[PDB]
Amino acid sequence: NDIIKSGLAEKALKALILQCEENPSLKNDKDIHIIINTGKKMGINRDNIPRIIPLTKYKLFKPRDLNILLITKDPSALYRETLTKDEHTSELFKEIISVKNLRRRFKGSKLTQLYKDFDLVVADYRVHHLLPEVLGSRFYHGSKKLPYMIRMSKEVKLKRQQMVEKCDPIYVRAQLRSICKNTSYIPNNDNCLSVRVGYIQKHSIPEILQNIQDTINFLTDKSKRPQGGVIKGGIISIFVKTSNSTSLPIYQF
Amino acid sequence: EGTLTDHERKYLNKLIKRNSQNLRSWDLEEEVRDELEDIQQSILK
Amino acid sequence: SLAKSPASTIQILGAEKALFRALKTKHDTPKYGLLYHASLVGQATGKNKGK
Amino acid sequence: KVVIEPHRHAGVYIARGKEDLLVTKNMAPGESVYGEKRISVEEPPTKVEYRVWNPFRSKLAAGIMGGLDELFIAPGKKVLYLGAASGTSVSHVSDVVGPEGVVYAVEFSHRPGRELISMAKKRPNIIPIIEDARHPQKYRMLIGMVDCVFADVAQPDQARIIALNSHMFLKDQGGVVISIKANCIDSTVDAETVFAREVQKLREERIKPLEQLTLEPYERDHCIVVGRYMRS
Amino acid sequence: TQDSNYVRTLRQIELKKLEKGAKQLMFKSSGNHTIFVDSREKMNEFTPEKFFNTTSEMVNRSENRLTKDQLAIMPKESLDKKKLKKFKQVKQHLQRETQLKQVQQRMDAQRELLKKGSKKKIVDSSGKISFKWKKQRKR
RNA sequence: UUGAGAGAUACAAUUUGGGAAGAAAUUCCCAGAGUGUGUUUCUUUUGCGUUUAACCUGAACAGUCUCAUCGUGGGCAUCUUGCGAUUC
RNA sequence: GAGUCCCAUAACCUUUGUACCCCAGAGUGAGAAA
RNA sequence: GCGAUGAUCACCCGGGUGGGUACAAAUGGCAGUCUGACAAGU
């Protein structure tokens, strides 16, 4: 909790929020990111699979706030019908589409239109590895709209047996609520890391500071492996920045 | 003859710790006995 | 000890080297063992010796 | 090297070290009577050969692992072993008594008896008696008074066999050790009920029971009853 | 037939290895040990340490309970871990034996189908398949 | 939500014996029981209803012919991706 | 149906016991003693 | 009171470890003893 106590963190956030108001070029910048300089190489190849960091104290977003796109295994008749009928998930998804239909309908410039319309993309884990070919480069560089893996039902796969295909609406809604409130990170085989911690004009400075400490604790705690505890050997320095603002230091070793 | 003095009942009883100390090395520790007990049941059954 | 052995063992009693090699390498096994030198086996000829 | 250490009961050792086993000194060194592993250790240094005692093969050894308080079998004591099927356990009993003591091995079935005789030649202190234990009067000549009576006979009327032998060849305040198989006596009822009856029958025969021990996991449905023969 | 021969030979070796190893190992006894006392008072005042005349921690050792009068260079942890290894090793022999046993049984069942006779395939609700042979005497 | 009995385990109060270290009280280590509560296993008593239940067996797979085994070709990787075993 | 014909009447490894050995090896080749 | 008929040239603490040659023994190890109902004649 030393980071929150340190005044350096508060002043930088005050400077960052203020100068976004002042500078026109940063007018479209809305999210707050922290840049973490790990001492040693993580050694994890970037799998493009988001890793959720639980933020206990505060919730970044709710499902009702964001455009959510669900990509399902073909055929989507069962999942679309079950989700659209159940009251809990009736109004949860902006659009439900299958992989084959997504590939056929959207190509080229249409992929850019899909990128803008949707704030969050979620996909069945079975079809996640196919998406990089389909969605294109734009979704898969930068990590702003990187798809999230979700599981339709609590059924499990057993070798030499066929999984029963079912859709559990309450489980899907529960996963999506967790995805929105909890921030996410992607491992890479280099020191630098970027994690979203706050949203300008929604989160106060004390809340963003708490989110940062939650991120640091989860990422450093070896007990939380394999999802957490990826930052071995401590953190050399931590910065704060928006998408187009530079790194303002908040901690240095 | 059961004529032990207060000191006699101390030196002899020190030996009890001394030799029993030697045996606990052979006796092996509690944690491993937890695994050994599980392995023993599987083999015996 | 010999009395408690089945008849199959007595047939191949003296050819353990060839038997266990063949068993482990999935090849054909011996068929005479030490009994090959019995007079009756000598009288037989061809495949009849194994029988 | 393996650190053989003394045991509570004289004539018994444990080859403590890495592989710790119950162990007895070999009377006739250089050979094993049923292929048991043999350990030799130099002691000031002269090597003394030792034999492994397998509890799963001998019920008496299962008693040692169970922690029997008192064993009347000890060096320099005469022992009467009833139900000596072979030299599997009698040889170890011969080891414990040592050259000074003697073991009276009693067997009925002829086929294991011939195995017993071939072993007795190696061990001078073992006197093999091939006769029915139900009629002790037949072999009274070959047996002197005995400090302890050990019985592994698996017969329904075993308590009578112990009484006749104990009344005859057991010294006053002598030893009585019995291994009981409840399945032979009564399979319908649980083992504890059967053992209670056997203790009662011994008491009627002027044998005071001292302790009782179940032999699990070495054997299922078995226990060893240790008593003292109080003629008075 | 040769496959059945090969696996059985492997299974026989594992069984013998298991028998030799288990003899080397020593198993701690787990059995009730009752003591008989003639007087009710002797029971109530009974104490294991007094009866065995030994220290309380010394009492709980069934294999070697040494009375006080009798009481009167390798690291232990390395010895302890290596002891666990031997106990695991005999268990691994047992697991290999059962696996070879199951493998042999399935091969033997297949061989019975190759032999002459009239057989009907019966399938249970669980999906297990078995063959029931007609009641015909062999000529 | 019947009665009684035996065992195991979790907790709370309390107690037995052995050892050390202390002038004694007292401190620690070891082994252990019974009491109250809760959970759980088994044994049987009683009240009520009910009279059959399960399995095996007779010439009981196979014209839309059935089955075994060795091969060939293709589908399932958006996964039964297939064990000297039976993926379609 | 099926390798006696690669000595299971055996080879190799380990333990123990007995008896000897710790200089060069196609050994070197004029010193040694005072 | 010399010589070509031949001069010269492992370890550790009196004790224990290390290495080598030969022979004998081991109920010490490798190491586990093939298949199982048809075949031949008119």
Q: Which residues contact E17 (CB under 8 A, 6 or more apart)?
A: E93
Name the experimental technique.
Answer: cryo-EM
Does strand H come within 7 Å of the CB of C9?
A: yes
Cβ-Cβ contacts under 8 Å for D225 (sequence gap 6 or more): D177, D178, D180, D195, D198, D199, D202, D209, D211, D212
Q: Best mutation site among E20, E26, E58 for testing chain B: the one with the most B CBs within 10 Å?
A: E58
The answer to whether residues D148 and D175 touch, using CB atoms and an 8 Å cutoff, is yes
For B42, which residue in chain E has the nearest alpha carbon? E91
Flag if B26 and D217 touch (Cβ within 8 Å).
Answer: no
First CA to last CA across chain D, in angstroms? Answer: 51
Q: How far is the CA of A162 from the C1' of F75 (A)?
A: 16
Interface B-D, measured as beta-carbon pairs within 8 A, has a size of 5
Query: Nearest nucleotide (C1') to the CA of residue C16?
Result: G8
> Residue E27: which residues within 8 A CB-CB, separation 6 or more?
B40, B44, D55, D65, D217, D218
Buried-exposed string E74-113: b where 16+ CB fall within 10 A, e elsewhere: eeeeeebeebeeebeebbebbebbeebeebbeeeeeeeee
Gaps in chain D (C to N over 2.5 angstroms) fall after 44
Q: Classify C21 as helix, strand or coil.
A: helix
How many Å apart are CA B29 and CA E5, to the nearest integer? 45
Integer Cα distance of D203 and D193 in angstroms: 16
**DSSP for B4-26?**
--TTHHHHHHHHHHHHHHHHHHH
Encoded tokens for E116: 């002459």
The β-bridge partners of A33 are A196, A241
Experimental resolution (Å): 3.2
Which of the 8 DSSP states describes residue D36? -
Provide the residue type at A46 as one letter. Answer: R
β strands within chain E, DSSP E: 33-35, 119-123, 129-133
Tokens of A127: 């079809």
Task: Work out the number of other CB atoms within 10 angstroms of the CB of residue D157.
Answer: 10
Q: In the block, which residue shows the tokens 């002043």?
A: A11
Q: Is A93 left (phi over 0), alpha (psi -120 to 50) or beta?
A: beta
Nearest CB to B44: which of D16, D20, D217?
Answer: D217
* Distance between D62 CA and the closest CA of chain E, angstroms: 8
The dihedral through the CA atoms of D193, D195, D199, D200 has a sign that is positive
Residues of E in contact with D199 (CB under 8 A): 36
Residue E84 near residue B35, CB atoms below 8 Å: yes
Residue E133 phi/psi, 5-degree rounding, is: -85, 145
Q: Which of B20, B23, B26, B41 to mutate to test the interface with D (most CBs of D within 10 A)?
A: B26
CA distance A53 to A227: 8
Residue A200 near residue A184 (C-beta atoms within 8 A): no
Strands (DSSP E) contained in chain A are: 31-38, 51-53, 68-72, 95-98, 120-124, 148-150, 183-185, 192-199, 235-241, 248-252
- For residue E134, the distance in angstroms to the closest alpha carbon of chain B comes to 38
Is there an interface between E and A (3+ Cβ pairs < 8 A)?
no
Neighbours of A226 (CB within 10 A): 9
Q: Which of E26, E54, E73, E76 to mutate to test the interface with B (most CBs of B within 10 A)?
A: E76
SS3 E126: coil
Helix (H, G, I), strand (E, B) or coil at C11: helix
Structure tokens at A145: 């709209």
Burial of B2 (0-12, 13-18, 19+ CB in 10 A): exposed
**For D123-168, what is the HEC assignment?**
CCCEEEEECCCCCHHHHCCCCCCEEEEEECCCCCCHHHHHHHHHHH
CB-based contacts of A229, cutoff 8 Å, min separation 6: A219, A220, A221, A222, A223
Alpha-carbon separation of residue E113 from C21, E6, E54, E103, E119 (angstroms): 29, 20, 67, 16, 8
Three-class secondary structure of residue E115 per DSSP: coil
Cα four-point dihedral sign D204, D206, D211, D215: negative
Amino acid in the structure at residue E35: I
- Rounded CA separation C40/A3 (Å): 99
Q: Please report the beta strands in E20-135, taking only residues with DSSP state E, as ranges in sequence order.
A: 33-35, 119-123, 129-133
How many angstroms separate the CA of residue E124 from the nearest CA in chain B?
A: 30
SS3 call for D38: strand
Distance of alpha carbon D54 from alpha carbon D218, whole angstroms: 10
- Cα three-residue angle A133-A139-A142, rounded to 5 degrees: 125
Supply φ then ψ for residue E55, to 5 degrees.
-65, 150
D114, two tokens: 């011939």
Residue D35 Rama label (left phi>0; alpha psi -120 to 50; beta): left
Q: What is the DSSP string of D170-223?
A: EEEEEEEEEEEEHHHH-SSS-HHHHHHHHHHHHHHTTEEEEEEEE-TTTSSSEE
Task: List all nucleotides in chain F with at least one atom under 7 A from a protein Cβ.
Answer: 16-21, 29-32, 58-62, 66-69, 78-87
Nearest-CB residue to E64 (from D14, D37, D69): D14
Interface contacts B/E by beta carbons within 8 Å: 49
Give the DSSP H or E segment for D23.
Answer: strand D22-25
Torsional sign, CA E16, E17, E19, E20: positive
Closest nucleotide to D31, Cα to C1':
H27
Structure token pair of residue D191: 């083992």
Q: Which residue from A230, A229, A218, A234 is spatially nearest to A37, judged by alpha carbons?
A: A234
- Distances D193 to A245, C36, D198, D205, E74 between C-alpha atoms, Å: 87, 61, 9, 19, 48
Q: By the 8 A CB rule, do A112 and A138 touch?
A: yes
What per-residue string of b and e applies to A104-139 under the rule 16 or more CB within 10 Å gives b? eebeeeebeebbeebebbbbbeebbebbeebbbeeb
* CB spacing of C23 vs E6 below 8 angstroms: yes
Nucleotide nearest to E7 (CA to C1'): F84
Which positions in chain D touch E79 (Cβ < 8 Å)?
18
Q: Which helix (H) or strand (E) holds D43?
A: strand D38-43
E93 residue type, one letter = H
**CA count, 13 A, side-chain hemisphere, A223:** 2
Q: Are strands A235-241 and A248-252 parallel, antiparallel or unpaired?
A: antiparallel
Name residue A27's amino acid.
Answer: K
> Which residues are A198's β-sheet partners?
A32
The one-character DSSP state at E106 is H
Q: Does B44 touch chain D (CB under 8 A)?
A: yes
Cβ of D134: how many Cβ atoms within 10 Å?
15
